[PDB]
C-alpha cells in the first residue's frame, strides 16, 4: 500500500562527525522505527518511537523528525557502524520497510591488491576457462574494471563479487572472472584488468600471458 | 469524560541543550482519538465546550 | 474459614528490568483465587497459596481480591508502574491492548520510590454470571463456563532511574488477598501450576 | 538472553510446501507476538506473518493472505509456519521475531539466526573447486576459485584456519544455473610453494569435502 522512501541509499563517513539519514513515505507516518543489519548476523533493538534508542547501544544517536521527514542524527561517527539500516511505520496492511542505508566508513584512498591468475589446468580439460582478477585493500568502492584483450575490450561475462568493509584494516575487495570457452580461451595470449583508482591518473595494468609456461 | 488520558511520553536526555524543543504536543486533537474512551461521546458530537486538566 | 483467605499470600514473582520500552507488556495476572506459579525442590513441593486452597473445594467463587504488589527497590529507583485490570473473562487478546489503549480502562500508577513499597489493588467483582465456576475441575472449554473474572496485565508505564552502585533491576512480589469474599457447593479438587 | 533458533530452510522446489519452527528461551510465552521477517539479499524487506497468543487472531499483508499458516503452542513453546505454493519470490532468508508493545505502536525487540530456504528445482549437486595461482613477490595473495554447487550454505576453510589473516571469501554469484564465488588468502612467500597451502570447502547439503592443493605453475 504505503511505501517508505529513504533517500540515503550509500554512505561512507569518516570516523568523527556527523551523519544524518532520512526514511520518508508518500503519506503521513506517525513513528518510525529503525534496526542495523551487520555482516552475518540478525538486527537486534536499535531505536524506537521517534528518539528512543536502544538500551545496550552507545547514547551518540538520535532520531528526530515528524510527518513526511524522519532525520537519524548521530553525533560522532565511529568504527562499528559498518552496517546496513532500515526503516520501519506501524501504519497500514504491509508493514513495510525502507529500501536499505548502508553507512560505511570513509578511509584514505589506496590503491587495489591487483592479481590476475590463470585458470587451473584440470579446468582447462573440463572444455572451458575462467581468467579471474583479484582485488584487494582499495577505497573508494566504485571502481571501473575493464578487459583489454588483444587490443579489444569485451566487458561481457564478468563476474563481479563486492565485499563489505572489513572491521581490521577498513578496506574493501572485489573479484572479476572472465568466464570463457576452452577454445575460445585459446585464442588470445594477452589477458589484461585493470583498475581506475582517482590518485593514479593511468589505471595500473597487470598481465600474463597464455603461451607463457 | 473525566479519566486521565495518557496524550503523550517522551524520554528526554542529556544531549538536548538549553530551552531545546523536547516536545510539541496537541491537547484536544490528541484527546479526541479512538484508541481513548472520550471517542464515544466526541464522534456522535460537533460542538464542545470543556475544561482541560493536564498532568 | 476467612483466615486463611484475608491474609495475603505470595501467589506469584516478577522483576522489573530498566533495559524495557516503555508500554511493555511485564506480567498478566489471571484474576482468581486459584492463580499460583511458586515451586520448590527442596522440598520437592509445589507452592499452592493459602488462598487457593480454600476456593478449590468448591465450584463457584466471588469476592473483592485484593492483590498486594510488594516492590524491593532502594529509595532511589525512581519510576512508575500500571497495573492496568481488563474484565470478563480468562482468555481475551488482552496483549493486543495498547498502553494509550489500556489507558481508557480503569487503572492505577505507583512510584517506585516514595515511603511505602506495597500497593493494594482492589478487585471489582466484574462478571456475566454473579459466581464464577470452577471450570478447572472440568477439562473443556465452553461459552458460558469460566474460569476468572478478568486479566491484569502490568504495564512498563515509566523507566527505571538509577545510579550504578544499586542495582538494575527491581523485583515486585504478588501477595494475594481478598475481602467479601463467598464460596459454595462443595467438592474436592487439588489445583495446578498456571505456568502463564 | 533471547535464543530464537530457526528451524527449517533447504531446497524446496517451487509449488511445495514447508514447515518453519521457531523456539522461544528464558521468556514468558503468552504475552510476546511472534512473528517472521523475510531477507532478501537484493531488497526488502517484506513482512509476512503473526498469529498472537490466543490463536484466534490473524493478521496477514495484501500478498501472502492465505497462503501462509502461523501457529503457536503453549506446551513446547515452539512456533510453526506452515508454507504451501513458493516460487522465487520467497527465496531468501527466514527470520523469526518477537513483538511487544509501546505507548502508540509496537516493536520487535529480538531476532534470530536465520535460516535459509532456496526455493528453486534442479539437483542438488556438490561444488568443484577449482585452485587459482599466479603463472615473485614478498606478499603472494593466493586463492581458490568455488563453482559447482546449487544449495546456498558453504564454507571455504583455509588448512584449518592456520591462514585465517588474509582471508577475503567473497559472497556467490549465481550464472548457468551454479553460485560461484572465491576466496583471496593472502600467503607469505616463505610458506608457498615451500609448505602446505590447501583449500578445504565443506558443502553441508551435499557432505561433500575437497581439498584443493594450490601449485607452483
Given at each position: 500500500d504505503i511505501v517508505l522512501t529513504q533517500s540515503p541509499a550509500i554512505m561512507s563517513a569518516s570516523p568523527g562527525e556527523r551523519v544524518t539519514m532520512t526514511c520518508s513515505a508518500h503519506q503521513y507516518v506517525s513513528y518510525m522505527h529503525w534496526y542495523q543489519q551487520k555482516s552475518g548476523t540478525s538486527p537486534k533493538?536499535?531505536?524506537?518511537?521517534?528518539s528512543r534508542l536502544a538500551d545496550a547501544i552507545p547514547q551518540r544517536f538520535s532520531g528526530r523528525g515528524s510527518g513526511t521527514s524522519y532525520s537519524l542524527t548521530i553525533s560522532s561517527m565511529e568504527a562499528e557502524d559498518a552496517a546496513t539500516y532500515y526503516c520501519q511505520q506501524?501504519?497500514?496492511?504491509?508493514?513495510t520497510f525502507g529500501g536499505g542505508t548502508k553507512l560505511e566508513i570513509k578511509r584514505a584512498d589506496a590503491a587495489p591488491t591487483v592479481s590476475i591468475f590463470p585458470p587451473s589446468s584440470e579446468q582447462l580439460t573440463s572444455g572451458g576457462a575462467s581468467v579471474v582478477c583479484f582485488l584487494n585493500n582499495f577505497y573508494p568502492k566504485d571502481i571501473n574494471v575493464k578487459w583489454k584483450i588483444d587490443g579489444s575490450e569485451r566487458q561481457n561475462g564478468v563476474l563481479n563479487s563486492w565485499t563489505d568493509q572489513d572491521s581490521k584494516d577498513s578496506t574493501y575487495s572485489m573479484s572479476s572472472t572472465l568466464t570463457l570457452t576452452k577454445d575460445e580461451y585459446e585464442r588470445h595470449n594477452s589477458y589484461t584488468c585493470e583498475a581506475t583508482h582517482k590518485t593514479s591518473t593511468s589505471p595500473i595494468v597487470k598481465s600474463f600471458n597464455r603461451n607463457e609456461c | 469524560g473525566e479519566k486521565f488520558f495518557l496524550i503523550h511520553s517522551a524520554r528526554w536526555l542529556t544531549t538536548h541543550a538549553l530551552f531545546h524543543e523536547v516536545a510539541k504536543l496537541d491537547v484536544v486533537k490528541l484527546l479526541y482519538?479512538?484508541?481513548?474512551?472520550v471517542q464515544g461521546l466526541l464522534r456522535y458530537h460537533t460542538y464542545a465546550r470543556f475544561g482541560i486538566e493536564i498532568q | 474459614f476467612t483466615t486463611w483467605t484475608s491474609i495475603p499470600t505470595l501467589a506469584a514473582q516478577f522483576p522489573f528490568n530498566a533495559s524495557d520500552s516503555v508500554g511493555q507488556q511485564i506480567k498478566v495476572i489471571p484474576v482468581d483465587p486459584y492463580f499460583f506459579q511458586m515451586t520448590n525442590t527442596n522440598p520437592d513441593q509445589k507452592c499452592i497459596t493459602a488462598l487457593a486452597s480454600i476456593c478449590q473445594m468448591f465450584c463457584f467463587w466471588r469476592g473483592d481480591l485484593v492483590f498486594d504488589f510488594q516492590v524491593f527497590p532502594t529509595k532511589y529507583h525512581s519510576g512508575r508502574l500500571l497495573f492496568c485490570f481488563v474484565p470478563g473473562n480468562e482468555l481475551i487478546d488482552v496483549t493486543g491492548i495498547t498502553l494509550k489503549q489500556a489507558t481508557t480502562a480503569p487503572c492505577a500508577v505507583m512510584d517506585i520510590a516514595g515511603v511505602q513499597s506495597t500497593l493494594r489493588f482492589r478487585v471489582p467483582?466484574?462478571?456475566?454470571?454473579p459466581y464464577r465456576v470452577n471450570r478447572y475441575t472440568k477439562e473443556a472449554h465452553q461459552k458460558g463456563e469460566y474460569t476468572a473474572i478478568g486479566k491484569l496485565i502490568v504495564y512498563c508505564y515509566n523507566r527505571l532511574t538509577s545510579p550504578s552502585n544499586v542495582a538494575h533491576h527491581v523485583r515486585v512480589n504478588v501477595y494475594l488477598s481478598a475481602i467479601n469474599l463467598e464460596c459454595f457447593a462443595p467438592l474436592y479438587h487439588a489445583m495446578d501450576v498456571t505456568t502463564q | 538472553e533471547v535464543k530464537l533458533v530457526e528451524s527449517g530452510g533447504g531446497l524446496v522446489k517451487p509449488g511445495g510446501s514447508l514447515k518453519l519452527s521457531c523456539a522461544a528461551s528464558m521468556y514468558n510465552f503468552q504475552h510476546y507476538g511472534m512473528s517472521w521477517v523475510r531477507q532478501t539479499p537484493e531488497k526488502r524487506l517484506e513482512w509476512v506473518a503473526t498469529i498472537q497468543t490466543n490463536a484466534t487472531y490473524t493478521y496477514y499483508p495484501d500478498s501472502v493472505k492465505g497462503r501462509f499458516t502461523i501457529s503457536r503452542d503453549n506446551a513446547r513453546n515452539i512456533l510453526y509456519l506452515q508454507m504451501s505454493s513458493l516460487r522465487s519470490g520467497d527465496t531468501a532468508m527466514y527470520y523469526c521475531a518477537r513483538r511487544d508493545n509501546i505507548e502508540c505502536h509496537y516493536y520487535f525487540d529480538y531476532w534470530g539466526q536465520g535460516t535459509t530456504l532456496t526455493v528453486s528445482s534442479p539437483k542438488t549437486t556438490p561444488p568443484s573447486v577449482y585452485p587459482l595461482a599466479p603463472a615473485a613477490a614478498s606478499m603472494v595473495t593466493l586463492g581458490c576459485l568455488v563453482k559447482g554447487?546449487?544449495?546456498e550454505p558453504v564454507t571455504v576453510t583455509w588448512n584449518s584456519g592456520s591462514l585465517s589473516s588474509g582471508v577475503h571469501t567473497f559472497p556467490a554469484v549465481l550464472q548457468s544455473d551454479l553460485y560461484t564465488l572465491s576466496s583471496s588468502v593472502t600467503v607469505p612467500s616463505s610458506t608457498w610453494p615451500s609448505e602446505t597451502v590447501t583449500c578445504n570447502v565443506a558443502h553441508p547439503a551435499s557432505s561433500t569435502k575437497v581439498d584443493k592443493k594450490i601449485v607452483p605453475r
Open positions: 533493538r536499535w531505536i524506537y518511537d521517534t506501524w501504519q497500514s496492511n504491509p508493514y | 482519538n479512538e484508541q481513548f474512551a | 467483582w466484574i462478571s456475566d454470571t | 554447487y546449487f544449495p
